[PDB]
Each structure stands twice: as C-alpha cells, then as structure tokens.
Amino acid sequence: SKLEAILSQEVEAEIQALLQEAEAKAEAVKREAEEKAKALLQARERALEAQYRAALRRAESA
Amino acid sequence: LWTRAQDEVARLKALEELASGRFGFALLGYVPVKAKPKVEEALARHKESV
C-alpha cells in the first residue's frame, strides 16, 4: 500500500540516518586511532634518533 | 473550559479504543448511508483522504 511503502521507507530512513551517524562516529574513531598511532610512531622515532645519537656519542667517547 | 475539557477527555477516551498496526492504525465504525455524504466530505477534509 501507499502508507505501507511510506512506513517502510520511514523506518528504513531512520535506520539509515542512525547507520550514517554511527559510521561517522566509527570513522572519527578510526581517525583518532590513526592520530594516536602517528603520535606513538613519532615518539618511537624520536626515541630511536636519541638512541642512535647516544650510541654515536658513546662510540666517539670510547 | 468545561466543554473544551469534556471534548478533550472524550477524545482521550476514544484514543484508547483504537487498534494499532505497528506504527500504523486501522479502525472500524458505522455511519448512515444518508450521512455518507457529510462523512465523505469530512474524509476528503482529512490530510490524506485516507
């Protein structure tokens, strides 16, 4: 029926709006996890650079 | 105010006697065939002519 299709379309549109909002939140969570991983990789890279600098300093000292 | 409250309370009591269709609604009633013209005019006066 016309009201049948309208009610099914309204339920599907509410589910689609909810799914789009949840997918936007999940993509924001993925972007935040990527930002935290980039910060951790930057910390590990600075640690490796400081370790190589200290190793070169110890080698030149010896 | 008493007439408006009687009208609103009658509408509230009439809302209890309905039958839903899971975000849908359907109902049955009895009206005269001689009063079918004004009832059809009111049905066309509805938001959808359902």
From TrEMBL, chain B:
It is found in: Membrane. It comes from the Bacteria. Signal peptide: none annotated. Belongs to the V-ATPase 116 kDa subunit family. This is V-type ATP synthase subunit I. The lineage of its organism: Bacteria, Thermotogati, Deinococcota, Deinococci, Thermales. The chain holds residues 252 to 301 of 652 of the full protein.
